[PDB]
Design a protein around this ligand. Structure first.
Ligand code: APR
Ligand code: APR
Ligand code: ZN
Ligand code: ZN
Ligand code: ZN
Ligand code: ZN
Lengths: 153, 153
């Protein structure tokens, strides 16, 4: 386990013949209101475009997933709500340890008057994506699929 | 766009204050048979465990997503089938450009007599995960959600 680089949000290490990128854990928040899902968009230098995502962010020191979920929802959309843990996933275990904890937010309230808030029906997000109009982040796709599977009724 | 490292499956670069990891595109295959989903497991050094995933892999030079999907299904499970493109997603656009193209495989046939083949009902995979018994890769979770949303009827 030798380190070739230690950065702000990631470290580059070598474990045998395996190239490994250590990355802080993350959270993502799925929120539905009046049939629209709360997506967010922002320029992502890594991909040169703004994919459709859902409120998300890295967990800060001393913070647990639930608290991070609350903070990101508030900082990115100015909203607060009743959060429930859903499930988690490793974004790409073949090379990084980034783990994302996904939450559901209900009974949204505006607590606060670079990130674009994009309320959109999940059916419309899926269609636009299928048309090649917009790209998805893993969190955005997860939100869309979760909705079609458990939030239509 | 300065490069600090050029490896086998990734490059570490710096674009201003942004740390960016270039990574080859990937494919993932969702396959259902007799109510069971085709998951695979393998030791992942990056996370120190074997999460539940679906057949997946990196696209090789001269290969397009569909062809890569065919190859990975065959190499990891010894099966072939009729593939249909579903959608794509960036695994974590906040730091890497890895993009995953997801396909659906139907009418599976065994063409060939480190990776463990795990046929499991998606409902069971979700339950085990909820119990903290198993972890998910983004591809594994996507497969589970996709099934609950569009493959139950
Ligand atoms: N961290 C790593 N560093 C260097 N080489 C690696 C690493 N992980 C795997 N490899 C090499 O790459 C080959 C595997 O290639 P793939 O077909 O692409 O499959 P794999 O990466 O192991 O899993 C596929 C899927 O999970 C995701 O994490 C990944 O991005 C891909 O979508 C193997 O022979 C192995 O030697
Ligand atoms: N590639 C990068 N390199 C260095 N710093 C970065 C990078 N990308 C963002 N940042 C810094 O981190 C802060 C953003 O922190 P987060 O709250 O974690 O949100 P962000 O990473 O931008 O998007 C959140 C979600 O998308 C995923 O890609 C990510 O892993 C997370 O789950 C910003 O103030 C910014 O300066
Ligand atoms: Zn944030
Ligand atoms: Zn921070
Ligand atoms: Zn492979
Ligand atoms: Zn290869």
């Amino acid at each position: 386990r030798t380190y070739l680089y230690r950065g702000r949000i990631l470290n580059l290490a070598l474990e045998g013949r395996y190239e490994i990128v250590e990355h802080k854990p993350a959270v993502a928040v799925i929120a539905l209101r009046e049939g629209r899902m709360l997506f967010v968009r922002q320029m992502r230098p890594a991909v040169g475009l703004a994919p459709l995502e859902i409120p998300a962010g890295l967990i800060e020191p001393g913070e647990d997933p639930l608290e991070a979920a609350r903070r990101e929802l508030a900082e990115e959309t100015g909203l607060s709500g009743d959060l429930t843990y859903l499930f988690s996933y490793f974004v790409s275990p073949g090379f990084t340890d980034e783990k994302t904890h996904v939450f559901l937010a209900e009974n949204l309230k505006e607590v606060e008057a670079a990130i674009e808030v994009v309320w959109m029906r999940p059916e419309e997000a899926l269609e636009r994506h299928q048309r090649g109009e917009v790209e998805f982040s893993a969190t955005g796709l997860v939100g869309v699929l979760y909705y079609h599977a458990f939030l239509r009724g």
